Design a binder for this molecule. Structure first.
Ligand code: CA
Ligand code: CA
Ligand code: CA
Ligand code: CA
Ligand code: CA
Ligand code: CA
Ligand code: CA
Ligand code: CA
Ligand code: CA
Ligand code: CA
Ligand code: CA
Ligand code: CA
Ligand code: CA
Ligand code: CA
Ligand code: CA
Ligand code: CA
Ligand code: CA
Ligand code: CA
Ligand code: CA
Ligand code: CA
Ligand code: FE
Ligand code: FE
Ligand code: FE
Ligand code: FE
Ligand code: FE
Ligand code: FE
Ligand code: FE
Ligand code: FE
Ligand code: FE
Ligand code: FE
Ligand code: FE
Ligand code: FE
Lengths: 163, 163, 163, 163, 163, 163, 163, 163, 163, 163, 163, 163
């Protein structure tokens, strides 16, 4: 089934390209106490996402199908919220990608089982994408991770209010 | 005039981001005799465009204004044709970016004079973007450049028909 | 079942070693308009094939079995056509490896399922070999890939005749 | 007018050397929640400032005039406040360089127009210095940049009081 | 099942950390004819084990669970013999890690199937750990590997007695 | 006195190995606002500690005595508190290593004088270890260093309570 | 005979300097289907020619004689046709250097025997120059090399006419 | 005006190519006390001149015009004295390039204003060439720069006679 | 005589390709006390042999003749014994390549004189191949080299029997 | 005694910062026959001085005290002559740093004994600073070092008068 | 006392230069089972010895005294046995440097106390030389280090006789 | 004739080792105006001489003969003057190596013809040694090379007297 692997590959590529533009957008406009920390972290996320975005589209051509990474396709086949414009707060960026990475990781997790029987090599690549996406999810989640000595509500980065 | 420099910077960033996704799209789906030549050349163009896309948005924040590099903004503030989907021919890719680079370079050329008096530092960056865009225009134009011994109609890469 | 993993590993190693000598042979004797393009591309294919040839034989020793990479074994356990001698045409090289990579990739695809239950780690390596082989198949296939504006018959690289 | 370019070059060099010693001073003595973040950021600012300090003095010798980068000249031709001694707070460092970079950038902006007609090459260098200084100004300003979801008063890094 | 992946990941991490300290211990105290050969080989094993020890604990945090790599946990959740103290003989080091790598590799092999259905991405990482552990097992086993012309009893490295 | 230098070297090695596992443990499980800052800082501390851990054990073999870096020895010859398990708060990590580095540095300071007369070369190495340990102590202490404009109580990273 | 080695060395240097300016000239002005392929290939030829141009003149000074690499000497001691000006066709560039490299290689081949008896070290250098020149001749000749399946007349790169 | 930018670009390229061959000529044949100092300095000048020679010709093709870097053009469009042949004295080399760099820098300075209105991007490149040429002029001028304690007549490098 | 240089070049290439597959075969299957020592040494030999195998075939194309490096040609134009299959003993590997390198070096030594008069450049390359082959012969011969204090019979690596 | 180590560390840092600005000042304005030789040598001295200036201030924070590297402190806690302004002669620069390095080295030599008992680790760093300062003193002293065949009065670099 | 530091420095330099030529001599002529192991190990020892040989002589010039590293001085101020000529056995090389490194290390240990009071910086360098020499002593001693399971008599590398 | 190649190789190695110690000796003790210039130049000569010293001895072992690079052999098989001790003048160093390099180069030139018939590969290496030795001879000779505008008597570096 070539159509099945294309669906899993093309859907993953569009999500990676969406995260590509969103990580870079927050990379430039993040503000607050953790602006520079997230500035550097989002650039590393961008480079890891961009690398796998190349691999996914390369895998699309490898199985004999075209790759659609156009701007209209990113907006069209959205299915994910768009990052807000203007200056972004550090606490807002942390909460945005905490949910975005988790949502993308869960979708990739399902696509792995959809193609594991017909295309284990493509499923191997999708597992590697799920690995880096869930790792990035942890790196955003750890900012507000509860500990025995501190719930880490994020009040210090959100004008005194829990995030 | 902060509004003038933002207009020149934001308009250039959106065009660079459009070329970013278009060079990479042709990078993966180009086909024909010159597919691998353009594959490598488009990746170099992508890296040069991406680097200046970072500098332009960085200059936006440097003058005190937010940067809009979101996917919807690329589609919204288009003003440039979209690259076709599916498998792309090498002759089609050459002619697409020959006109696209030239159109972008002419617009950047006008923005340089619009901000040279109020923001010479930003105009200095826009000149550097115009330099790399017009250089890429030559690199696409040279495929069909007429010579005394050969008009270079591109018939060999376009099913026997002049491009 | 140690015998099953050895069969899949040893058969893949011999095919990689055959492609090793064939890519390098075409690397030196390719001729025509695309001689230098294929010269560089075949060297990259050679380096990727050689690296995985090391990994496959290393995996053979890791599971406790000897590795047979001798010259007589490459000729003996052939099951693949031999590249022609003498000066090779660029269109001939493109069509040779288009079919050779596809044939090798299909065989590796079958070996993955043969060992996925008894040796998932070896199957993981075979998936990585299938990934690079099918990627190389695309890189040879793209020279003659049909497009909406051009069928890309390869007449320009084959003395006016469709390849 | 050689005297005009020397004035713009020598005044810029002294300001860069002042920022050189001030960024490094805060680099070692910064304290608080953002001490290590600023520690790394100030070292990058120091390296960029030092590089352009070399270029400015090199340009001075290139136009045929001596370069005065002595310690007494930094103190003499001050015209900028001195960074406080002892342990420095992170919020204090952020506010110090937010104003210092902006003041230096505005002065360099004026010097560009003073020499653009008689020495466009020197004005080109001064534009590059203004670029990196205003970029560093943004990197300090972003710590307290107001956002729709958070004014970012810096209370968390200033003992509960808005910075 | 989060508990299942944590069990496989945490158990593998403790075994890797045990091999970490054991390879380094033998790295410093190995003696005999093959002391320097094993000195270098054990350092390479240490670097490969340490890298995957980072990946395993990183995967633990990625799936949302804490990582226990404390010294007491290495001793507590032992289940593997401790390397002897004092000066170690080369033949003793070869036989120690021949069995240790094999025991660890067999356990990781079982954990792959335990989590392959619920967490294929984690199973993908465990397969990579099993790959490097079984490769290191071969590198220790080859010192005493029987050949048609020599049984390789190791008498030369064990005071004239077969190892 | 060989026994004196062994005592100073072996005791320092065990403390370095304890800090090795503790910095890496906090490196993976740190949480809160400063989780990523400490994540990077603890990895640099880990690399510096690991390098000197190699030098100390190498010096042990150089003076003619075995090196004991086994896991049981780290737990046995403890004399330092164990880092807590589970998710660690950033303020908890800062206070843990502030005291741990200081305690280790004071012990190494005493060992330098114990061996300076009989083994100045070993004392030279112990001085280098004390240098990097006290430097790391400052890097943890600076998070809560009092300043004229801010006492830096750490309330922002400790749920509103002074650390 | 110092005069004999100077003649062989000085004549080779002038030919290398002529090829230096000619490869770079075609590097910038080549046009057609193979413009970018030759653009890259001519830059590699330029770097290899320039390196040996340094070695030849260095050998001239080593044997105790001055080196004449002036522009007038390149034009004066020509004895080779000049590359045409303006935009150059890819087929024209291929045929120009196919004959130019061959002519230079044959002359260097004769100079090797002229100095092999009196200056074997200089003859050793001239052999290395002949090696790289004849290698470059093959790299230009392979574009039109006849094959059993294709004569490679170059009609596709020469407006339908055999080159 | 395309003709205006071509004139400024082509005239600068020929002067750079002339300095290219002249710096390298003096690089090999310089003699005296400062032969090795100038040997190294002239090689650095050669690399900087060669790099900008590439950029100038690349800019020529970017604006849509051919580039003439042939040997006959260097001799034809001379307008600069030729470096003497044979062994060159260090004092002679210093005085030759002191005037040559200054003459070239003054001409480039005039071309910047000739094209600043019609082609600011090309004028930006010409400013960068003027920067490196005037920097090299200082590096040659400093050998004989008068000081309060020493006029630096160069008598020590010119057989006792002031240069 | 083109036929003479082709004979010397083609015969050397086939021998290098035979040693290529044989060094790599022993690289993977060597066993015994010196397995890892030879494992590393054979990989270095493989890289040196492979590099000169490229140069020899490149020289074949440079003189205008095709290069035959196919697998069947390695087996056909053998004239050298084949390395045994299965697990190889370290003493067996040492004795195999001691004779193999010597036999290849003697043949290359004869080919140098066969082509030194008609093709000194090719003879220069064959001398470089003889240099690396005879160097590798020494590196295998030194394992059993007799010394005044020890005949080095290899009994320790050959089950107590002299090799 | 914390006050003792601070005195030795702070006094050394100010002297290093003074040499920092003085080496760089002479680096840009040195003139005469040895201008370029000293230009390069002073840049190497600057990099070595700057590196130890970082280490000294880092050691200050490591022992728990603030670091004062401000411009006013360099001028205030002077105790060393200031380098002259304007163009500097090479002989003047050589004699300036010959005495300056020696004076700084003697002071650091005394501080080593002042803190060797209370702070051997800090004394270890001060010894390393004395090492590089006395090495730089030799590198300036060697220009006028007397030899059996030449007193090296420096008349050639000082307008015919002994330095 | 300048004479005291010169004595310790000059005596150490001559011993390092003696070990320099001896390690390299054994590096080329070592034979037996461990020839290649010692070949690599002796090259690393040579590089470490050569580096400190540079530092010692550099320290000699730094304190104001000439450095005598001539060949006659190595033979004259010998006081160490000369390595035998001809082919050297591996067991002979191991025993030669086991005693040579120990003898050199003991002498350097005494020189440290001779100059620690008058020249602590030089004593610091001599401690670093003693560190690397005693480390190399361990690396040679470990070949015959006794273990609980094996006395490691070296019979396997010494024709069946204990070394 | 093995004895002939050994004679040429061993004699060249001893001369290279003599120049090794002499270049390094002058590298440390050179004095005068050109001390630092020669300091750097002699270090480059040392590295080139040392590299070929390794190749020569490696070639000795490759042809089956031992290599004698001991200190006594350098003094014994001298046949070259010894460099003077103590502080060396720059003019003395220039004249010493001008004659030393020339004498060594002439001897190597004769050895090439002595072994060219029996050992062309060894003669190829000796030609490469003669190349670097005669190049170094030029680099020392150029300091006093006569020019049309200056005889370059070296009076400025030799207390007013011609060298
Ligand atoms: Ca898998
Ligand atoms: Ca994988
Ligand atoms: Ca906030
Ligand atoms: Ca400008
Ligand atoms: Ca610029
Ligand atoms: Ca086409
Ligand atoms: Ca063809
Ligand atoms: Ca604060
Ligand atoms: Ca043993
Ligand atoms: Ca917290
Ligand atoms: Ca054409
Ligand atoms: Ca002169
Ligand atoms: Ca054996
Ligand atoms: Ca002077
Ligand atoms: Ca000390
Ligand atoms: Ca030290
Ligand atoms: Ca032996
Ligand atoms: Ca030859
Ligand atoms: Ca050669
Ligand atoms: Ca002198
Ligand atoms: Fe790609
Ligand atoms: Fe950025
Ligand atoms: Fe391998
Ligand atoms: Fe500089
Ligand atoms: Fe990590
Ligand atoms: Fe180690
Ligand atoms: Fe050169
Ligand atoms: Fe170029
Ligand atoms: Fe090749
Ligand atoms: Fe620092
Ligand atoms: Fe040195
Ligand atoms: Fe060697």
């Amino acid at each position: 089934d070539l159509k099945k692997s294309v669906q899993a590959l093309q859907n993953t590529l569009t999500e990676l390209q969406a995260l590509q533009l969103q990580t870079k957008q927050a990379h430039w406009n993040v503000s607050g106490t953790l602006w520079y920390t997230l500035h550097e972290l989002l650039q590393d996320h961008y480079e890891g996402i961009s690398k796998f975005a190349d691999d996914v589209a390369e895998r699309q051509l490898s199985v004999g199908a075209s790759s659609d990474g156009r701007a209209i396709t990113i907006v069209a086949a959205s299915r994910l919220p768009e990052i807000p414009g203007g200056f972004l707060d550090d606490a807002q960026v942390i909460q945005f990608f905490t949910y975005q990475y988790e949502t993308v990781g869960q979708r990739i997790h399902q696509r792995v089982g959809d193609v594991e029987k017909v295309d284990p090599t493509t499923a191997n690549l999708l597992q590697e994408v799920e690995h880096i996406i869930e790792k990035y999810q942890w790196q955003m989640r750890a900012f507000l991770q509860n500990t025995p000595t501190d719930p880490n509500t994020g009040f210090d980065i959100n004008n005194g209010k829990p995030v």
